[PDB]
Amino acid sequence: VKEEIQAKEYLENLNKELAKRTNVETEAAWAYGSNITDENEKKKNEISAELAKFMKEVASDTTKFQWRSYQSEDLKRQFKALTKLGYAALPEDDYAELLDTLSAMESNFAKVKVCDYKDSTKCDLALDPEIEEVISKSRDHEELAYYWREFYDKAGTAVRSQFERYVELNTKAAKLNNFTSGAEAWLDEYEDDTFEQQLEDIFADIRPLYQQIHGYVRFRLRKHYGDAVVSETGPIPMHLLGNMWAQQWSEIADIVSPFPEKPLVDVSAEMEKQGYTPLKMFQMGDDFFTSMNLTKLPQDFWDKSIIEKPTDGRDLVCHASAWDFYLTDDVRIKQCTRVTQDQLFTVHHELGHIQYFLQYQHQPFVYRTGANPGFHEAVGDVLSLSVSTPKHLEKIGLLKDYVRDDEARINQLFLTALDKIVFLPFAFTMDKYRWSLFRGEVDKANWNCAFWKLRDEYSGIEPPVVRSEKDFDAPAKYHISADVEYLRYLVSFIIQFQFYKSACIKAGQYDPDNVELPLDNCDIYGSAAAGAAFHNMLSMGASKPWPDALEAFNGERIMSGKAIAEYFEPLRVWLEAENIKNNVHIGWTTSNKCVS
Ligand SMILES: *[C@@H]1O[C@H](CO)[C@@H](O[C@@H]2O[C@H](CO)[C@@H](O[C@@H]3O[C@H](CO[C@H]4O[C@H](CO)[C@@H](O)[C@H](O)[C@@H]4O)[C@@H](O)[C@H](O[C@H]4O[C@H](CO[C@@H]5O[C@H](CO)[C@@H](O)[C@H](O)[C@@H]5O)[C@@H](O)[C@H](O)[C@@H]4O)[C@@H]3O)[C@H](O)[C@H]2NC(C)=O)[C@H](O)[C@H]1NC(C)=O
Numbered sequence: 001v002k003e004e005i006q007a008k009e010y011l012e013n014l015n016k017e018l019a020k021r022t023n024v025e026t027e028a029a030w031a032y033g034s035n036i037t038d039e040n041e042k043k044k045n046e047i048s049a050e051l052a053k054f055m056k057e058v059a060s061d062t063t064k065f066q067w068r069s070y071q072s073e074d075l076k077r078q079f080k081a082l083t084k085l086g087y088a089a090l091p092e093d094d095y096a097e098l099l100d101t102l103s104a105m106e107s108n109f110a111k112v113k114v115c116d117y118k119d120s121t122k123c124d125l126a127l128d129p130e131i132e133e134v135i136s137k138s139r140d141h142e143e144l145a146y147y148w149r150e151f152y153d154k155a156g157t158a159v160r161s162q163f164e165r166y167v168e169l170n171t172k173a174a175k176l177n178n179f180t181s182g183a184e185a186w187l188d189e190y191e192d193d194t195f196e197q198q199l200e201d202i203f204a205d206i207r208p209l210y211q212q213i214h215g216y217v218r219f220r221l222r223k224h225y226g227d228a229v230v231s232e233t234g235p236i237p238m239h240l241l242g243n244m245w246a247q248q249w250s251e252i253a254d255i256v257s258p259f260p261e262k263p264l265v266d267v268s269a270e271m272e273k274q275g276y277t278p279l280k281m282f283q284m285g286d287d288f289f290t291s292m293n294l295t296k297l298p299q300d301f302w303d304k305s306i307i308e309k310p311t312d313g314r315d316l317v318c319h320a321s322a323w324d325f326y327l328t329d330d331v332r333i334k335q336c337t338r339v340t341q342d343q344l345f346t347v348h349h350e351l352g353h354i355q356y357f358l359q360y361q362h363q364p365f366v367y368r369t370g371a372n373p374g375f376h377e378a379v380g381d382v383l384s385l386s387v388s389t390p391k392h393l394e395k396i397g398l399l400k401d402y403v404r405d406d407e408a409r410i411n412q413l414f415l416t417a418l419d420k421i422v423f424l425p426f427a428f429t430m431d432k433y434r435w436s437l438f439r440g441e442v443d444k445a446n447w448n449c450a451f452w453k454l455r456d457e458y459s460g461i462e463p464p465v466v467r468s469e470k471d472f473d474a475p476a477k478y479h480i481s482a483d484v485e486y487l488r489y490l491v492s493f494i495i496q497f498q499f500y501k502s503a504c505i506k507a508g509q510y511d512p513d514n515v516e517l518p519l520d521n522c523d524i525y526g527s528a529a530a531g532a533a534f535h536n537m538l539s540m541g542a543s544k545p546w547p548d549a550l551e552a553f554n555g556e557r558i559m560s561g562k563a564i565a566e567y568f569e570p571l572r573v574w575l576e577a578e579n580i581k582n583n584v585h586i587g588w589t590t591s592n593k594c595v596s
Pocket residue numbers: 176177178
């Protein structure tokens with residue numbers, strides 16, 4: 001159609017206008033997250049309401065263009081993106097109420113403080129860093145159960161009524177966009193109507209390995225705490241797993257390591273000894289990206305980022321985040337950085353988001369986002385996989401006197417699995433839970449025990465104390481309180497191994513027939529070949545359906561669990577044999593810790 005001329009001019013101006021309007025909303029959201037006050041809350045929400053009103057007008061104006069009739073797939077793709085209003089489809093008053101509900105939940109989470117286990121006078125312990133410090137380090141099971149209960153009562157139960165209204169308005173918004181529910185609204189980002197089934201299939205392939213790891217960990221925990229604390233046949237008490245949500249278990253590696261007399265990589269002490277700071281950690285992340293011929297952090301990043309928890313009295317959101325301001329080179333991180341191994345990896349994860357921002361900033365506004373949400377989460381994790389290798393850690397002087405024999409290799413593979421395999425059922429359940437509420441599949445009388453039932457069924461973990469429908473535990477996880485879709489992380493954990501394997505081959509760092517080049521010791525630091533693949537993919541933003549973006553990276557078009565299974569194959573062989581040798585019980589009875 002000749003109208004395509006025009007349409008192209010229309011999109012040109014509109015994209016530029018959206019970027020500028022979104023810059024303004026983003027600044028107000030940054031100010032609030034950096035400094036939680038009633039005044040900043042009001043300002044964030046009023047500017048969002050303003051932009052929502054404009055979006056309503058945009059979606060309306062698309063109907064004046066015959067865009068479905070156009071020759072250009074590119075023009076059609078842009079118009080389609082503009083018709084998708086999300087929450088902005090809601091009536092003015094409903095949108096304002098939703099924004100008020102969202103900030104009530106996020107500020108509740110950020111403001112949680114508990115009393116010291118040993119000093120009921122001292123009541124200023126926050127999750128980050130005080131409570132997380134205990135959960136990751138204490139081996140006093142009663143102390144752990146105390147902090148678990150205090151946190152969940154305050155971050156979870158306290159916001160049930162707000163969470164209920166959020167579900168209602170989220171559903172109403174989805175239906176105004178003609179999605180069945182918000183589950184379908186979220187899934188739309190993956191542009192694939194078999195996406196859920198694809199993930200069920202990949203998950204089913206990896207589940208048996210998870211069950212072997214679970215069995216071995218439970219066996220080792222029984223030896224440490226005794227059978228009064230940990231049963232052989234039941235779900236693992238979750239507070240013993242070194243993470244408030246039991247989402248990753250690497251913090252208890254020193255008590256569950258396959259070979260306790262051989263080295264286990266933990267560089268936190270060496271980081272401190274060498275005088276590492278948050279600034280140094282970010283500079284090192286920047287170095288990694290630039291070493292691969294990727295983009296250096298701009299001056300705005302250094303000038304405007306927050307890389308340490310503020311020491312004034314203020315309330316803020318400490319959960320780490322990366323921010324795109326939709327201009328040129330105005331990108332920032334807010335991280336309450338600590339000097340630990342886990343935090344070094346976290347820094348690289350966040351800088352992965354920043355790199356993606358810089359790579360696609362020349363794209364039209366609607367294309368300035370990930371190919372799918374899993375792509376955005378994957379970027380930094382691919383580098384963190386290299387950072388975590390004995391190979392890399394020796395290069396930067398953090399790992400000393402390391403002998404990489406067969407036993408040390410198993411220890412390192414197991415340590416990696418405690419993050420990478422353990423996470424998979426966890427991440428699947430965060431969205432299976434919310435989807436089921438969104439879809440109206442669970443009665444409100446059953447909402448809490450529906451959460452714990454999924455945690456049991458998929459992860460084989462349970463609360464430390466008996467819960468019931470008088471509690472409401474799901475919002476005790478940040479993303480649930482903050483209305484952040486979680487499937488992105490499951491997709492990320494699968495595809496990051498496809499990216500890592502390919503980048504390692506391109507770097508000459510992995511050859512399956514060369515004993516000297518194992519995938520689990522690959523360091524892509526300094527590889528321009530690996531960097532080129534990233535540039536080819538990331539610079540696309542969301543200009544093409546995601547299989548096109550994967551193709552740009554390594555010639556493949558299919559999400560596949562083959563690469564993650566390849567990485568862990570030596571661990572699988574060893575672990576299956578070890579569990580047989582030690583008569584380790586696999587599987588678990590149904591939990592008794594959530595009362596109907
Ligand atoms: C989610 O799904 C919803 C449906 O469940 C959908 O809502 C529908 O959107 C339609 C707009 O696309 C709308 O259709 C219009 O209907 C008008 C009259 O409807 C009235 O009576 C209904 C009861 O019978 C009531 O329920 C309504 O509230 C209304 O009061 C028509 O007058 C109108 O017509 C005009 O527009 C067409 C479209 O023209 C198109 O564009 C060009 C013109 O430049 C054409 O050449 C082209 O071929 C194309 O057809 C013209 O053909 C016509 O001449 C008129 O100008 C129109 O048909 C419908 O009413 C509405 N609701 C329902 C219940 O059907 C939502 O839009 C969906 N939401 C999202 C976000 O996608």
